[model samples]
Target: MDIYVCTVCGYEYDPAFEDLPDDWACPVCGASKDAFEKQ
Candidate 1:
């Protein structure tokens, strides 16, 4: 699994749950999935 971090709110999402959808938004900061950076 890959890691994803939200650039807007610095939320680190664990890949163990599920891959983020294309239109997924940050649950923390409400940022678009495009705002996330793959880690």
Candidate 2:
């Protein structure tokens, strides 16, 4: 699986999160999709 990192705060997004919502917010710093980068 791939991981997504937050450019603003260096937080990692887990691909195993099957409960991902369209309204999902960053769990670390509360950022949006604009702050995420697929790595």
Candidate 3:
């Protein structure tokens, strides 16, 4: 499993099964996945 945090809303996301792609948007702040950080 891969974990990514949203830099905009501080939402923690786990990318698995359904998985997120590069264009995925943050559900909380609507920020692009590119704005997410693995740290």
Candidate 4:
């Protein structure tokens, strides 16, 4: 699976944790899933 990185904040998401929900918010900047980009 591809890793996700937050745009608003510098949060690097680990796909191994779980699939990101459509409503998922960034734990750091609280940005929505749309703010994330594949890394």
Better of 1 and 2 by lDDT: 1
The 10-residue segment of model 3 with minimum total lDDT is 13-22
lDDT of 2 by residue, 2-29 (tens): 8788888888777777667787677778
Which ranges in model 2 have alpha carbons more than 4 Å from their true place?
none
Q: How close is candidate 3 to the true structure, as a TM-score?
A: 0.65
- The TM-score of candidate 1 is 0.64
Residue range 1-39, candidate 3, lDDT tens digits? 477888888898776647445477877788777888886
Worst 10 residues of 1 by lDDT: 14-23
In angstroms, give how far residue 13 of model 3 lies from its true place: 0.8
lDDT of each: 0.79, 0.77, 0.76, 0.78
> Which is the leading candidate under TM-score?
4
Q: Kindly report which residue pairs in candidate 1 clash with one another.
A: none
Name the lDDT value of residue 16 in candidate 1: 79
In model 3, which regions exceed 4 Å deviation?
Answer: none
Error of 3 at 12 (Å): 0.6
Instruction: Give residue 25's lDDT in candidate 1 (0 to 100).
Output: 83
